[PDB]
Amino acid sequence: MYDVTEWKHVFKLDPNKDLPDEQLEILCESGTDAVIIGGSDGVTEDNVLRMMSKVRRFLVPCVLEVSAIEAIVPGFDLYFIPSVLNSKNADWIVGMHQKAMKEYGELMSMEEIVAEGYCIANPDCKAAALTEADADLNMDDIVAYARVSELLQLPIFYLEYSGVLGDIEAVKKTKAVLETSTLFYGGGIKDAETAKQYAEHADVIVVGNAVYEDFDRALKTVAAVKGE
Amino acid sequence: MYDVTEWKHVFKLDPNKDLPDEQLEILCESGTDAVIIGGSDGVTEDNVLRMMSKVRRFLVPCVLEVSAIEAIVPGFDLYFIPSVLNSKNADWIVGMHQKAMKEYGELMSMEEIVAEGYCIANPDCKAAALTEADADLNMDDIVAYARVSELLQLPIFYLEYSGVLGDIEAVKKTKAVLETSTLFYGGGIKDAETAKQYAEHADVIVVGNAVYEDFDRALKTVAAVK
Numbered sequence A: 001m002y003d004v005t006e007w008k009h010v011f012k013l014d015p016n017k018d019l020p021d022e023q024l025e026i027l028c029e030s031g032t033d034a035v036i037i038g039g040s041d042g043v044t045e046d047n048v049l050r051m052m053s054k055v056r057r058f059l060v061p062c063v064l065e066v067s068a069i070e071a072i073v074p075g076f077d078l079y080f081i082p083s084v085l086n087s088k089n090a091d092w093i094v095g096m097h098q099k100a101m102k103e104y105g106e107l108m109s110m111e112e113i114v115a116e117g118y119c120i121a122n123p124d125c126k127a128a129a130l131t132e133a134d135a136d137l138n139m140d141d142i143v144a145y146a147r148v149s150e151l152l153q154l155p156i157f158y159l160e161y162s163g164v165l166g167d168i169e170a171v172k173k174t175k176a177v178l179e180t181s182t183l184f185y186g187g188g189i190k191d192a193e194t195a196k197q198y199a200e201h202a203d204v205i206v207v208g209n210a211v212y213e214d215f216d217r218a219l220k221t222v223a224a225v226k227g228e
Numbered sequence B: 001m002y003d004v005t006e007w008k009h010v011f012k013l014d015p016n017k018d019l020p021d022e023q024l025e026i027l028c029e030s031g032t033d034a035v036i037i038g039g040s041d042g043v044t045e046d047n048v049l050r051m052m053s054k055v056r057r058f059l060v061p062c063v064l065e066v067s068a069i070e071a072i073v074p075g076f077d078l079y080f081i082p083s084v085l086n087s088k089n090a091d092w093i094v095g096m097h098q099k100a101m102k103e104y105g106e107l108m109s110m111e112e113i114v115a116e117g118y119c120i121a122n123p124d125c126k127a128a129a130l131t132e133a134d135a136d137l138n139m140d141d142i143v144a145y146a147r148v149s150e151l152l153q154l155p156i157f158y159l160e161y162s163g164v165l166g167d168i169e170a171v172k173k174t175k176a177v178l179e180t181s182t183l184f185y186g187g188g189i190k191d192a193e194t195a196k197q198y199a200e201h202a203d204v205i206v207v208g209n210a211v212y213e214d215f216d217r218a219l220k221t222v223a224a225v226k
Ligand SMILES: CC(C)=CCC/C(C)=C/CC/C(C)=C/CSP(=O)(O)OP(=O)(O)O
Pocket: A012, A014, A038, A039, A040, A041, A066, A067, A068, A069, A081, A082, A083, A084, A091, A092, A093, A096, A097, A100, A126, A127, A130, A131, A160, A162, A186, A208
């Protein structure tokens, strides 16, 4: 019953960090379309489990973006499973996913799962290092990864720039080739202005790091794209 | 595009070989559901080209299985682009797709393309060495590759054993977990009896090099199954 093609904004929270309960509550009731519990690396099941319990009470859909088999926790409304399409190591595309299925096939069949075709386009971030992504891409390299996602009919193509604003032109061209995939963009969105700019091309903008750096400023990204 | 969920039998041909006399024609007129142009130890644009000119004239859908970017040729009803799910080389999982999209994006848009999830389950064959496949798999491994296939939305999961018959129990168990894709089985089918046996679990049986070894016998695999 969760339709990402109707979404416009999502906050991505890092279970490795701590947020005041007051802020976590404010983010869940902010009007964002989803609260995603992310991770990238070093995540632990206990932090994920505490966060699940803290966000589940709210009406907003809570999503667990799976980044480690040890950190799959029941209780979330949805599960996003990333596949790093430009990874140079099969583990981040399919390998870890096969081990998870082998180990938790049953737990996996009982949840709503959505695969995300990730394209990590910032060569200098923790995510690119970890996943051995060939992240130094020209725009047509990115557009081609988007075409690959559209061909596999991955519900989500996520252009990931991490802590930097990505080339807006690459967001506009990616969007132009996606006909079924929902385009998620994440990267340097810290306020109303940037939020509004990227929301012009992405189907969904992801605001994450900013919540920890300047909370009040990051909160305005919601009204910035859903407001009057 | 042609609907593979209705198929039951397909012959897969090696564009590097040629059938004698009118055998290609009898095969394309046999009742099989599709003729797939494949090939091992790589293919060349020339053989594929020549094969395409031969099979496009018939009603049976003709499919090019794209195992090499350099051998793509326009003119087929369908193009299957494999992802070797158990490959250790990302180039066989997503790289081929990305190259085709980057180098032949406009050709890709004008053709009907189907992404197939491949699982090479025979560790002792050309395909496995060529794709660096982790092919010494137990049954629960295969079952898990099939789940990944569907997670990735692939319309086809192709369980490949090449030159030999695969464990019939593996076929039955993979058919059991696939809730939304079509199960292709390939591997050592050379006659009516074995084709019938694997057709009990697989959605589509692929009969390949048996057509060069014993044509009359491979031809009976169509009726055995349909
Ligand atoms: C275990 C399993 C079933 C599949 C493996 C899942 C995979 C491929 C995970 C890697 C996904 C990553 C690095 C996501 C970025 S979170 P982010 O956007 O917050 O970036 P950051 O944490 O700041 O590095």
